Ligand binder design. Structure first.
Ligand SMILES: Nc1ncnc2c1ncn2[C@@H]1O[C@H](COP(=O)(O)OP(=O)(O)OP(=O)(O)O)[C@@H](O)[C@H]1O
Ligand SMILES: Nc1ncnc2c1ncn2[C@@H]1O[C@H](COP(=O)(O)OP(=O)(O)OP(=O)(O)O)[C@@H](O)[C@H]1O
Ligand SMILES: Nc1ncnc2c1ncn2[C@@H]1O[C@H](COP(=O)(O)OP(=O)(O)O)[C@@H](O)[C@H]1O
Ligand SMILES: Nc1ncnc2c1ncn2[C@@H]1O[C@H](COP(=O)(O)OP(=O)(O)O)[C@@H](O)[C@H]1O
Lengths: 748, 69, 113, 68
């Protein structure tokens, strides 16, 4: 209700303020332009207020010109400063306070004086005029009682317009008014999980009533909602509400779960709000309500709709915080909130993030630049000295103290004015850097990962994986090339990011490769959901990872809280055949449905299945090996299951030269953990060869290497550490002389 | 059909301007506003009557395209 | 040396913290350098501007508000949070009790600080 | 003062926590006689977590006892 409340006189003032920026060569419309535009319209009520206060027009211009400056500007893009919209926001509040229904020129002056931060506020402040003095100047110069008492009305709240408008839910309003206009099943039921928005749906329907948007069929109908917090003694009160509604003919009920006769005859047009879990348990089982309800699919809005909602609601937050918000930050905040936070859905997680970012930047910017603190301390100490001198009957020093205090106060006022002029001159825009800092503190993701543009991360994936998984270039290149095709858009959007089958000897590094891929993609090492197929052997176990059937009492619950995770399966060849039917659905459709009816998404998860089959054949070119291993893979698996796999990964055996690099990587990783003590650890080539043959076993792979390192290097290092900081800040060298392990202690 | 919305907005803004002028102790400008509001109400009534007469004159029949949609 | 030298209703059941902090009789709140900033950050938001201290009893929750009032005397709070008295409601005081909060909440809104 | 709240003898509180872990093998053998490998393995495994070689988030250690 912006243009609907402004009168003809206010539009002239706004036009004058807009045209003043062109003459003043200002690219932004500040609070000073509104004051100048108001003095050029001596026809409204505000003219008489300033006339009685001995305030002319020429004095205001010369007073406001000194505070402001002059500079270059651009052509067009004449927007409003964040401080300027606060006056417009306060004018409506002032109009509502005085029991008025219009926004004229008499409210612009009142709103300009309540800012206390812009250029216009100081002009009134310097003329011994405050809010209290100007408040009285304009004032002196100027039915169904049971239902309305046992429930909460909605049209009354929407009539005043004190809440944010419902923007972006236009699709559901049309469906609701379409269902309400039907003859049979004219009682829509809002179906959706708690967290996507269901109570606010009726608020949007009620808002359109005031705007005269509903047709004549839905014209002049009050919206009433019956809360569940007010409920044998309560049954005597509901018998009269239904009778009152029937006699009125215009009351619309809104419930969230006796009333079977009321709904069978079409007497009450109630709107349900029950979730899908209870809809199939308290409504579908009853035939009386099955023929009178129409479910409506209500879910969270898409990413594009959230950007529009935030753009529509941008003006509201730019006034309470007085921080300019650019378009680049709005589109980034929604993406960041949808990427990391996955517990409250949309769009409630996109407004609080930008609100916190704006509050943080306003708090950081609105501080003292080490200028007023010293002056305030000097004023305080001078006042204390004067107070001490007064009680000491020392009037000789008090004369000098009073003059010093007056000079300090004058300097403090000048410094505050010159400090606030600079702050008013500049603009505090919001960028993605501020939002990244706020979002980093909620999950713990390092700032170096959030600021990534998701452009160089995929290109350097081959180098990142080799840091933790050395060797096996064929396995790394295949997955790096297969994961980027789905992200670019070459693959079907509904299918998951990728599906792979790990084959080869046990203990070769499949789990380490999965952990490295998860850390390099999602930025977290613990963002992996490990599902062990060893426990899924009987038919009764298939109801565990998909959901417990009703009447009796995993994967779906875990994947919902972490939509960005790598699913890892162990021993996929040992599982119940019914599990493959569930698994194929994930790869084909992309989403599952549990017993509660809630649908989980799998478009942001990498499915990795590890099988031990074919290990006995390798131990007895990469393309030839893949072709030979493919024939034996379908012998015990479904012929059509392997067609849905993006690629087959075959690992190779670990040679003698590859084992030295594993020990080197382990030593380097151990060194990083001792960064707090500044310990340098270096291992010679002889020691790496000596320790490699101790745990050399093709059956276990690199597993025996950890035990040898922990029993050889760590055991001797721990004793030296616990000798009273013997090697604190020094260099430790490990060299094998041939018989035992020689540890030489040096300096750093 | 994008006919009565503008007339309703004009009537609303004229009523709001008259209400603002009443509290401003400016009765000279309110005389024209009252006549303008009366003329706008008469025009709105005529436009609504002629719009609903045309709707009553015609009939809407369902086709196979609507069922398919 | 001696010879040679307001909202009263709202404050009836609540104790003002800044009055106690002005004299400096209690120990200064030193150590909560990250909680006062978080509280003043949450209080400066358009939505969800009512922070709630969550923690087990024994880590310190009532004393957190003392530090917020302490910064008022030291001129550390910004202009938005300048000259605002903080009152703590006593839970041990409580139909009969419903008539007292209505008068307190009306005065709190009118005071604005 | 702190000894009077838990009953811990003063000889136990006043320790540098540097020689107690080093002499853990001798201390355990006083009350447990035999099976030197089990005592040595746990004595070497428990001192690595306190030194800092083990991740701070994980606990001090985990052991599985097997045998009669
Ligand atoms: N390419 C590699 N380079 C260095 N170390 C590796 C490599 N592959 C595996 N490792 C090491 O293997 C060790 C064992 O890892 P983990 O216990 O996850 O088993 P795995 O070898 O992946 O086998 P499995 O698939 O049978 O569980 C890890 O500590 C890791 O350091
Ligand atoms: N190596 C040992 N040195 C000294 N005493 C020992 C040793 N092993 C066992 N004991 C003593 O044996 C006694 C009998 O209990 P024991 O330790 O044999 O069984 P346990 O380990 O407690 O049995 P369970 O496995 O059934 O719980 C104990 O009081 C213990 O002092
Ligand atoms: N059209 C909309 N635009 C922006 N935010 C909305 C819209 N509709 C609902 N919301 C948000 O949803 C929240 C209320 O959700 P609620 O109705 O409680 O969900 P549920 O009914 O599932 O508990 C409000 O805080 C509001 O910000
Ligand atoms: N910043 C601080 N520095 C030192 N001590 C503090 C600080 N904040 C609180 N305390 C201690 O906490 C105690 C009060 O705890 P209290 O708030 O009553 O805990 P709870 O609210 O859980 O009962 C005081 O005795 C005080 O010594």
């Amino acid at each position: 209700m912006l243009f609907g409340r402004l009168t003809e006189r206010a539009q002239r003032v706004l036009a004058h303020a807009q045209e003043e920026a062109i003459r003043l060569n200002h690219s932004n419309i500040g609070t000073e332009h509104l004051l100048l535009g108001l003095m050029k319209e001596p026809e409204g009520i505000a003219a008489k207020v300033l006339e009685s206060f001995n305030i002319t027009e020429d004095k205001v211009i010369e007073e406001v010109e000194k505070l402001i400056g002059h500079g270059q500007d651009h052509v067009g893009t004449l927007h409003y400063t964040p401080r300027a919209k606060k006056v417009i926001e306060l004018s409506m509040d002032e109009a509502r306070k005085l029991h008025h229904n219009f926004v004229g020129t008499e409210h612009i002056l009142l709103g300009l004086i309540r800012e206390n931060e812009g250029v216009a506020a100081r002009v009134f402040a310097n003329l011994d005029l405050n809010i209290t003095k100007a408040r009285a100047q304009v004032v002196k110069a100027l039915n169904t009682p049971t239902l309305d008492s046992l429930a909460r009305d909605l049209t009354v709240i929407a009539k005043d317009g004190t809440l944010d408008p419902v923007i972006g839910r236009d699709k559901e309003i049309t469906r609701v008014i379409e269902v309400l206009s039907r003859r049979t099943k004219n009682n829509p039921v809002l179906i959706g999980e708690p967290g996507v928005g269901k109570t606010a749906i009726a608020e949007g329907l009620a808002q359109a009533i005031v705007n005269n948007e509903v047709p004549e069929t839905l014209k002049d109908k009050r919206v009433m909602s019956l809360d569940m917090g007010t409920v044998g003694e309560f049954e005597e009160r509901l018998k009269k509400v239904m009778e009152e509604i029937q006699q009125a003919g215009n009351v619309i009920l809104f419930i969230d779960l006796i009333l079977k006769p009321a709904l069978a005859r079409g007497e009450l047009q109630c709107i349900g709000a029950t979730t899908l879990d209870e809809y199939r348990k308290n409504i579908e089982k009853d035939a009386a309500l099955e023929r009178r309800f129409q479910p409506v699919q209500v879910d969270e809005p898409s990413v594009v709709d959230t950007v529009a909602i935030l753009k529509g609601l941008r003006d509201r937050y730019e006034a309470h915080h007085r921080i300019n918000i650019s378009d680049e930050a709005i589109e980034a905040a929604v993406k960041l909130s949808n990427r990391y936070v996955s517990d409250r859905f949309l769009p409630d997680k996109a407004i609080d993030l930008i609100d916190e970012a704006s509050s943080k930047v306003r708090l950081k910017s609105h501080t003292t630049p080490n200028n007023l603190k010293e002056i305030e301390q000097e004023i305080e100490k001078v006042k204390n000295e004067k107070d001490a001198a007064v009680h000491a009957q020392e009037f000789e020093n008090a004369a000098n103290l009073r003059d010093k205090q007056t000079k300090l106060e004058k300097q403090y006022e000048e410094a505050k004015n010159e400090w606030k002029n600079a702050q008013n001159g500049m603009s505090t825009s919001l960028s993605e850097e501020d939002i990244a800092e706020v979002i980093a503190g909620w999950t713990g993701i390092p700032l170096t990962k959030i600021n990534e543009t998701e452009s160089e991360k995929l290109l350097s994936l081959e180098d990142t994986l080799h840091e933790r998984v050395i060797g096996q270039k064929d396995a790394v290149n295949s997955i790096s090339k297969a994961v980027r095709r789905a992200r670019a858009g070459l693959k079907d959007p509904k299918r998951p990011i990728g599906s792979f089958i790990f084959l080869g000897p046990t203990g070769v590094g499949k789990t380490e490769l999965a952990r490295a891929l998860a850390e390099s993609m999602f930025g977290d090492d613990d963002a992996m959901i490990r599902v062990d197929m060893s426990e899924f052997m009987e038919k009764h176990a298939v109801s565990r990872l998909v959901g417990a059937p009703p009447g009796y009492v995993q994967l779906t619950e875990k994947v919902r809280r972490k939509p960005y995770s790598v699913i890892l399966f162990d021993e996929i060849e040992k599982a119940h055949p019914d599990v493959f039917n569930i698994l194929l659905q994930v790869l084909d459709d992309g989403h599952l449905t549990d017993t509660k009816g809630r649908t989980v998404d799998f478009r942001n998860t990498i499915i990795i299945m590890t099988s031990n089959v074919g290990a006995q054949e390798l131990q007895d070119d990469y393309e030839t090996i893949r072709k030979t291993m493919l024939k034996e893979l379908k012998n015990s698996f479904r012929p059509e299951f392997l067609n849905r796999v993006d690629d087959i990964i075959v690992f190779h055996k670990l040679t003698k030269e590859e084992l030295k690099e594993i020990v080197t990587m382990m030593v380097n990783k151990l060194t990083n953990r001792l960064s707090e003590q500044n310990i340098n650890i270096i291992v010679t080539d002889k020691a790496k060869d000596k320790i490699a043959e101790e745990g050399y076993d093709p059956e276990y792979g690199a597993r025996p290497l950890i035990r040898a390192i922990q029993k050889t290097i760590e055991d001797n290092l721990s004793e030296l550490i616990l000798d009273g900081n013997q090697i604190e800040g020094k260099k430790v060298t490990v060299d094998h002389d041939g018989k035992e392990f020689k540890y030489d202690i040096a300096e750093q």
